[PDB]
Amino acid sequence: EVSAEEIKKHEEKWNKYYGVNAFNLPKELFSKVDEKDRQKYPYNTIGNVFVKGQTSATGVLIGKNTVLTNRHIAKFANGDPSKVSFRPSINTDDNGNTETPYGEYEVKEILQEPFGAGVDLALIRLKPDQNGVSLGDKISPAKIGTSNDLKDGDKLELIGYPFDHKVNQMHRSEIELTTLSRGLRYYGFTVPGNAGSGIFNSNGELVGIHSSKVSHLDREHQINYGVGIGNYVKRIINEKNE
């Protein structure tokens, strides 16, 4: 039971992201990443995880051949790697011109729930290109930070592919952390395609991965939910990354 004032104020914040049209959102909270920034770190570590005829979400390159995304996204492939494709820094302008600066990568192995069925993270291992060159040799993987030092009120950058808004167009969303006692929760604009988006701190370190929206305060309100890179997650990553 939370005071009726909290709900009133929550609806306040939440509304500044979902009350107005996505296109009429302030640049500071939600904006497309231009060609220039897309070639720079950490933006170039972001890619589109494409599951043929299932979904189109986001993923972060965290190793030479490893992509970190959500378990719920990886489940759509039903264990079959050939159903998943990773397209780093892909971009499709409003006129249909699609470009993939680093090519498209095939998946050799899917680790659906290496952190546990209750942690919405999965690892995707990619095959090198036909010349045997790993994506991680073309682009430096994201630096892995920690979520242990974050605190209520903190502002972070969420980078991903908001498919439902614009197809194959990388966007950044400013997020504001809230009640962290119940997990990584935050205010910000996201759509289903943002699943797997990287959350970076001012130091450019990856501190979390966006997951989805969950009930908040009561059973009738929402908030964004992500998975923080805590002690347990880092251990597993360091153990299976490659």
UniProtKB/Swiss-Prot annotation:
GO terms for biological process: proteolysis; symbiont-mediated disruption of host cell-cell adhesion. Its cofactor is Ca(2+). The keyword Hydrolase applies. The active site is at residues 72, 120, 195. Keywords: Calcium, Hydrolase, Protease, Serine protease, Signal, Toxin, Virulence. It holds the Pfam family Trypsin_2. GO terms for molecular function: serine-type endopeptidase activity; toxin activity. Its EC number is 3.4.21.-. InterPro entries: Glutamyl_endopeptidase (IPR050966), Peptidase_S1_PA (IPR009003), Peptidase_S1_PA_chymotrypsin (IPR043504), Peptidase_S1B (IPR008256), Peptidase_S1B_tx (IPR008353), V8_his_AS (IPR028301), V8_ser_AS (IPR000126). It comes from the Bacteria. Has serine protease-like properties and binds to the skin protein profilaggrin. Cleaves substrates after acidic residues. Exfoliative toxins cause impetigous diseases commonly referred as staphylococcal scalded skin syndrome (SSSS). PANTHER family: SERINE PROTEASE (PTHR15462:SF8). Belongs to the peptidase S1B family. This is Exfoliative toxin A.
